[PDB]
Amino acid sequence: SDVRPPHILVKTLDYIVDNLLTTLPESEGFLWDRMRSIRQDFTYQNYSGPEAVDCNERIVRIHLLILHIMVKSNVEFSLQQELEQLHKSLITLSEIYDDVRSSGGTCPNEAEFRAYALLSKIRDPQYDENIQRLPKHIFQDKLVQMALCFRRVISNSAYTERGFVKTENCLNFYARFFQLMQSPSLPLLMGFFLQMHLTDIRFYALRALSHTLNKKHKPIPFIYLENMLLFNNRQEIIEFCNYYSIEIINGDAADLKTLQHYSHKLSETQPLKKTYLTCLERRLQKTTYKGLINGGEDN
Amino acid sequence: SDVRPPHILVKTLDYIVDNLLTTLPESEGFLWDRMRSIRQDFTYQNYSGPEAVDCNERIVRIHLLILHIMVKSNVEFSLQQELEQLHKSLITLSEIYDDVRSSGGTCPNEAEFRAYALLSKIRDPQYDENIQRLPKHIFQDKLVQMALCFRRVISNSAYTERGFVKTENCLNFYARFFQLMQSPSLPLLMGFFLQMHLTDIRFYALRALSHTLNKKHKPIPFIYLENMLLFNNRQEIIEFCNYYSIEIINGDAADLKTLQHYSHKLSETQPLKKTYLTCLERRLQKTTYKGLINGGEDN
Amino acid sequence: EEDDEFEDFPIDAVTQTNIWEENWDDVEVDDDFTNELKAELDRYKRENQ
Amino acid sequence: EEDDEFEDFPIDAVTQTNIWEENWDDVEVDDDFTNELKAELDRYKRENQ
Amino acid sequence: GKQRILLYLVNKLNNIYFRIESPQLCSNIFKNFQPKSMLAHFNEYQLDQQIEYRYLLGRYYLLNSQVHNAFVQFNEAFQSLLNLPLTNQAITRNGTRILNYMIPTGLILGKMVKWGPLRPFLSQETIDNWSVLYKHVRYGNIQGVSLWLRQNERHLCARQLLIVLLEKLPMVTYRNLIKTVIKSWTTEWGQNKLPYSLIERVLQLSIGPTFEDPGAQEITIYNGIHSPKNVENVLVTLINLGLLRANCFPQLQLCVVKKTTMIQEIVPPVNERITKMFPAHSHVLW
Amino acid sequence: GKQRILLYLVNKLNNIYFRIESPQLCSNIFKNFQPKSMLAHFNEYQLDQQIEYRYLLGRYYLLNSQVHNAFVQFNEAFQSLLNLPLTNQAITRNGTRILNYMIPTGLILGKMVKWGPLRPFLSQETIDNWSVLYKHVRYGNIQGVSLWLRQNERHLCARQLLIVLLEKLPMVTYRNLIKTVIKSWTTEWGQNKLPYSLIERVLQLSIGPTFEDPGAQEITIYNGIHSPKNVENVLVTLINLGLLRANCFPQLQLCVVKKTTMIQEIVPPVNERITKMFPAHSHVLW
């Protein structure tokens, strides 16, 4: 047959939400391709109305949920071809929020996804550019503002990645990052997206601190670091420290000036595997998968 | 600290050709630096006259002779280092020649190095582009003609390499290539340069033939392949098949059907050691190193 | 005038017009080269049968 | 805006005009922050020792 | 929108790059057109603006030997210039400009022009000069093709056409040549297999004097690439290009094709065969 | 130079890219000026044409937060304009357009403009406004800046300035704040060991209310980034940016500067440091 119409692709997604999220830890791949289709079968038909807004939105939300669940359950899902669809769905949304704005319409749920958009690339000044062009009320919504803080806070004039151009006077506020992350005001799904930066944020935190220490300074107690960079448990610190060759003393502290890497990304070495924050895992268990996904108003 | 004048920069070279080319199988790294020196010293002056030409010209030649020699011995040297420094004297020789023209002058050896220039990027369509822009006497000089043929003959509509766009209706005239490499009219230096393509020329000749063979065709005799590809001897051709995973049958033949790679460059198996032609080399032996370099009109 | 650069259009669909020859219209025996080809195809067939 | 776009210029070496300040002094006094900051620095000096 | 002279500006600019001996600087302008946002506006500018653009874009491709790539562009150009409202003596002169590239682009892709529609754009001497090359190619006269390029060399070079033809015209000319053989040998004389010795003397007639064949001794681009002594190879390419459906038996010394009276089962129609191995769509402007 | 209208066309074009809100497309145009040949011509076009190119290259740079890059261009630009007859609206008013970017671009690099020379180009109202921000940044009053930014939020967003000032202004303000502390605590009272507890009290005075404090319950970009709670972090970043010369002692909880009366030795002049870590080049048009 041809392409499925609006309301049945809505109802299709519904079934996935109401019955198959609870099985996400193992093979999201299924749910992935079946969502890819819905987002596809709506562009093929060139239908950019409420049905498409809503469905694309939730697929973004679901994609977010998957990001956490795959890391916690620490089942292997991909080296994140996940972020792409998540991205490809976010630009699709952007376009739709845009023409609706042109047609004098209004989307109830834009700020949320403008905010998610702001967090996908986090160091890309491109997105700082766009968000200044948007309407006052979109710019000033709590969700967009918070995401701006996170970008402002994550910025670091020392970030080293090939292709990346370093910029002047960057905050490198690792302190207010883990601060903000624990805020009971931060939306959960939004927190999940941000967890994808725990390592690099941390690496440049230690490399920054280590730099201020004079040579004869004593090793820094794990307990200190643990709190500074809100690690989950002393086990994660150990693993962090051997992955970057930060020699440990007494299995109890780290000699920071032994950290001699310029970039968080080591030369042809498999990234330290993605982690999470207890803080938000806790939040997840006290709630329902479906509940997260139909957050926000009706289109 | 000081930059020696053109007058003595020449005779530094004159000594280098007259007296140090004999030790060349090992004195490579040395003769390299001493030629880089002369080149740089020349351009720190902004001096691009009959000296800058002559020395640069001879340095191209010398570099060519260094290509052959290092390959016959297996003094394994700098992969790339001989070739691109060959280009910086070419790209300079190039725009030097250009100015001389737009200033009413002429250089008695442009044709010769226009031709070398064509062989350095044998699949680059740019050199096909600018050569059709040069004066008539240069485009129709035997040397560039010679080169244009090689370029056409080597063209391959199947040639795969990362980022390379395949063009339609290419000759893949490997048979005519080897006929030409054996010509008594082929400038000896040119031949040395072209030898850089023996392997890839061959590989794309064999994968081409393996397609014209109907399945169950009985394996192609060495005695034949040592003619279809003008190999040096029975054992090189053996080595050849072993690299690309062909398979020898009975020590006399090879089963071209068992050849299945698209590309001449295997995934990350470092390139096959490059080779030469037994005919070209002993062409070299009954002439002198000096003669090859000092060959060419004066300025 | 003569160069390859478009002259200026002045200042202010029908599709069809097939401009490519779909099938040829020449007599094959009225072309010399073409008969030398046949004529020697014969010489080969006659002999090396 | 479109009023950020250079106007058409009319038709038709001197180095200098140093337009930048050399240092941070030469600036307005802001009493209510500066003496609050000094106030703080004193009470700290006066107490904690 | 408020970008109404963008295309005008683009062409003006790309033309300049061509006027200098350096048109590779165009791709960066061309590339600025694949943003989703602007690709969808290219169709909103004046048609004569699109035509000019497509013309430049077409010539660009050809400079990089991307023939079909170039073709679709020249095609859209001329087709659009035909259902152009006016006819000033400049518009037709531009159509002339387009054809000077469209003719050889098409030939390489195994396509030849219906001179009917083009009569008002070309001088009969041009039509004749292409006409003669048109047949040399059609009947498989390699030496004919060479000597035509040789005549026409100089102002073919002036347009960057000398070389692309010299390399890309051969294999078409070869298809035709071998097709005539195959026809009269395996459909008319029902002779399944063709020995190399056959193609050998066929190739001698077609190719003519080679590099240091007696009389010719300086290598030249016109007698240095083609030699009848290379029977097996000219077949292998023809088969790899999908221009011919056959097989080779290197030691048996013969070429085997399918036994059949229908010629286009063994020598398929040259054009579609190329376009299949080298697809190229029209709304890519870079 | 030759093809005299190139630069003219280029600026014509990029101004459009900006107008349609896609300045990131200018990148491909800029990149066309780096080939040796193309680079030479640039300083041969009309001066007022060079100037505009620098003013767009500048704005472009600032959009990617390459502040020193943006600076050298806006600088060179505005200096060149000053040898034109500063007597006609056109020229006068285009200097203004440049100052609107040049002033905050420079402030970030720790440089204040000399109001004299600019009075013909700026209103008192404008000069007044920028003078307030100069105040807070100098005196190290973070709350002051956060409120200045908040007060011209909308206008700043329009010229796309808000976000780069929100982020890159603070560390200049911090350095100024911490220098004041160090001045009267180390060079006047001879104490080179700074207890975090001291600096914490200073930061609080400077920062004002933060997110999740009493009466501050919704995030803004104005209260969600700066907390006097993370003394060590701001000292660490300053030290890392080269703005401050000292050491941190996490366990002893104190910052130690060198024992000196020359404050310049522990807190170097800011622009000198920033540009050292972020070199730029006037003769780069891309």
From Swiss-Prot, chains A, B:
Residues 81-272 form the PCI domain. It is found in: Nucleus envelope. Transmembrane segments: none annotated. Heterodimer with THP1. The SAC3-THP1 complex interacts with CDC31 and SUS1, and with the mRNA export factor MEX67-MTR2, the TREX complex component SUB2, and the nucleoporin NUP1. SAC3 directly interacts with MEX67, NUP1 and SUB2. Component of the SAC3-THP1 complex, which functions in transcription-coupled mRNA export from the nucleus to the cytoplasm. SAC3-THP1 functions in docking export-competent ribonucleoprotein particles (mRNPs) to the nuclear entrance of the nuclear pore complex (nuclear basket), by association with components of the nuclear mRNA export machinery (MEX67-MTR2 and SUB2) in the nucleoplasm and the nucleoporin NUP1 at the nuclear basket. Belongs to the SAC3 family. Present with 339 molecules/cell in log phase SD medium. This is Nuclear mRNA export protein SAC3. It comes from Saccharomyces cerevisiae (strain ATCC 204508 / S288c) (Baker's yeast). The lineage of its organism: Eukaryota, Fungi, Dikarya, Ascomycota, Saccharomycotina. The chain holds residues 253 to 551 of 1301 of the full protein.
From Swiss-Prot, chains C, D:
GO terms for cellular component: cytosol; proteasome complex; proteasome regulatory particle, lid subcomplex; proteasome storage granule; transcription export complex 2. Disruption phenotype: Impairs mRNA export and transcription elongation, and induces strong transcription-associated hyperrecombination phenotypes. GO terms for biological process: double-strand break repair via homologous recombination; filamentous growth; maintenance of DNA trinucleotide repeats; mRNA export from nucleus; positive regulation of transcription by RNA polymerase II; proteasome assembly; proteasome-mediated ubiquitin-dependent protein catabolic process; regulation of cell cycle. It comes from the Eukaryota. Keywords: Acetylation, Phosphoprotein, Proteasome, Transcription. One of its GO terms (molecular function) is molecular adaptor activity. Present with 5590 molecules/cell in log phase SD medium. Belongs to the DSS1/SEM1 family. This is 26S proteasome complex subunit SEM1. It comes from Saccharomyces cerevisiae (strain ATCC 204508 / S288c). The chain holds residues 30 to 89 of 89 of the full protein.
From Swiss-Prot, chains E, F:
Disulfide bonds: none annotated. Transmembrane segments: none annotated. Its main location: nucleus. One of its GO terms (biological process) is positive regulation of transcription by RNA polymerase II. One of its GO terms (molecular function) is RNA binding. One of its GO terms (cellular component) is transcription export complex 2. It is found in: Nucleus envelope. Residues 51-262 form the PCI domain. Keywords: mRNA transport, Nucleus, Transport. It comes from the Eukaryota. Present with 1140 molecules/cell in log phase SD medium. Component of the SAC3-THP1 complex, which functions in transcription-coupled mRNA export from the nucleus to the cytoplasm. SAC3-THP1 functions in docking export-competent ribonucleoprotein particles (mRNPs) to the nuclear entrance of the nuclear pore complex (nuclear basket), by association with components of the nuclear mRNA export machinery (MEX67-MTR2 and SUB2) in the nucleoplasm and the nucleoporin NUP1 at the nuclear basket. THP1 binds to RNA in vitro. Heterodimer with THP1. The SAC3-THP1 complex interacts with CDC31 and SUS1, and with the mRNA export factor MEX67-MTR2, the TREX complex component SUB2, and the nucleoporin NUP1. This is Nuclear mRNA export protein THP1. It comes from Saccharomyces cerevisiae (strain ATCC 204508 / S288c). The gene is THP1.
